C-alpha cells in the first residue's frame, strides 16, 4: 500500500532516506492488534478513527479528551490519514487531566489497568501501549511500566523533552521498556529531545500533523509524538508476525535505519524507526 502526500513522519518510517512524502506499508495495517494510548484521552468520535477508537478508562470526572494531546497521539498510532497502523484498535486510558497533568499514583494505576484490561479485549495479533508522559525519576513509576511490559504488552514511552539525560526521568529510565527519542524532518535530533544510554530508538517528533479535539487536526512536537510512531510500528509488525510484544523494541532497533541522525550525543543510539516494507 502507498499513501501519497503523507505526513512527513509516516513517510520517514517507511523510507531509507529523508525528504520523501509517500507512506508505504503492508495493507494488513495492524489489523487484529490493539494499542492503548495512556494520556489525556481520545476523542473517539473523530471521523479519522473510523469507529476503531474507544475510551476504556478514566480517573477523572469525564473520559473525554478536553486537551487534545491524547487524541493527537492516538491519531499517530492509528488514524486513517495520520496513523502508522491504520487498522489497529485504539483504547484510551485517561491518566492525565485536561491540563495534561497527572499524579504518579494515577499514572501507575492506569498502567496496571492495561496489564489486566488486555485480557478483556480481542487482540489476537498482540497488544501495545503508548505512554506519552513523564516526570522525574521514580522507581515506582518505572516498576509499573516494567510490570506492564512483563504482562505481554509492548510498552513504548517518551524519552522526555528536557534536552537532558533520560536516566533522570520515568518511565523513560526503565530498562525493560522501549524509550523513544524525537527527530526532525532533516534527520536531526529534535532540539528538545532527551538522550542517553536509556534510549532504545528515535522516531519522528518535530512538527507532527495528527488529529485533535473538536474533529480537527494540528501540527505539534514532542517525544510524545515520536512514541506513537513506534507504538504504531510495533502493532503493524506484530500483525505481520515479524515480532512479539516481548521483543518488538529489540526487533525495531535491530531493523532501524542506523547512523543516519545528526546531533546524537556520544553514547546515545543512532537508530531511527523503519518498517522495512518492500512495496
Ligand atoms: Ca530493553
Swiss-Prot record:
Keywords: Calcium, Disulfide bond, Hydrolase, Metal-binding, Protease, Serine protease, Signal, Zymogen. One of its GO terms (biological process) is proteolysis. Disulfide bonds join 34-123, 178-249. It is an enzyme of class 3 (hydrolase). It catalyses: Hydrolysis of keratin, and of other proteins with subtilisin-like specificity. Hydrolyzes peptide amides. Its cofactor is Ca(2+). Ca(2+) 2 binds at residues 16, 260. Ca(2+) 1 binds at residues 175, 177, 200. Coiled coil: none annotated. Residues 7-279 form the Peptidase S8 domain. GO terms for cellular component: extracellular region. The active site is at residues 39, 69, 224. Binds 2 calcium ions per subunit. One of its GO terms (molecular function) is metal ion binding. Its EC number is 3.4.21.64. Belongs to the peptidase S8 family. Hydrolyzes keratin at aromatic and hydrophobic residues. This is Proteinase K. The chain holds residues 106 to 384 of 384 of the full protein.
Amino acid at each position: 500500500a502507498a499513501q501519497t502526500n503523507a505526513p512527513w513522519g509516516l513517510a520517514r518510517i517507511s523510507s531509507t532516506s529523508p525528504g520523501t512524502s509517500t507512506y508505504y506499508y503492508d495493507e494488513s495495517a495492524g489489523q487484529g492488534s490493539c494499542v492503548y494510548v495512556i494520556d489525556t484521552g481520545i476523542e473517539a468520535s473523530h471521523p479519522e478513527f473510523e469507529g476503531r477508537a474507544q475510551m476504556v478508562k478514566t480517573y477523572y470526572y469525564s473520559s473525554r479528551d478536553g486537551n487534545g494531546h491524547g487524541t493527537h497521539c492516538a491519531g499517530t498510532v492509528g488514524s486513517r490519514t495520520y496513523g502508522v497502523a491504520k487498522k489497529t484498535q485504539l483504547f484510551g486510558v485517561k491518566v492525565l487531566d485536561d491540563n495534561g497533568s497527572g499524579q504518579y499514583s494515577t499514572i501507575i494505576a492506569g498502567m496496571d489497568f492495561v496489564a489486566s484490561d488486555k485480557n478483556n479485549r480481542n487482540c489476537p495479533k498482540g497488544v501495545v501501549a503508548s505512554l506519552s508522559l513523564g516526570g522525574g525519576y521514580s522507581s515506582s513509576v518505572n516498576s509499573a511500566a516494567a510490570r506492564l511490559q512483563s504482562s505481554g504488552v509492548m510498552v513504548a514511552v517518551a524519552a522526555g523533552n528536557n534536552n537532558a539525560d533520560a536516566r533522570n526521568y520515568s518511565p523513560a529510565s526503565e530498562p525493560s521498556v522501549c524509550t523513544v527519542g524525537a527527530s526532525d524532518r532533516y534527520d536531526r535530533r529534535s532540539s528538545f529531545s532527551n538522550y542517553g544510554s536509556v534510549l532504545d530508538i528515535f522516531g519522528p517528533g518535530t512538527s507532527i500533523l495528527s488529529t485533535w479535539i473538536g474533529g480537527s487536526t494540528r501540527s505539534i512536537s514532542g517525544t510524545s509524538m515520536a512514541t506513537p510512531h513506534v507504538a504504531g510500528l510495533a502493532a503493524y509488525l506484530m500483525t505481520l508476525g515479524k515480532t512479539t510484544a516481548a521483543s518488538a523494541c529489540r526487533y525495531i532497533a535491530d531493523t532501524a535505519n542506523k547512523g543516519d541522525l545528526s546531533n546524537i550525543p556520544f553514547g546515545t543510539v543512532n537508530l531511527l524507526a523503519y518498517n522495512n516494507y518492500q512495496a
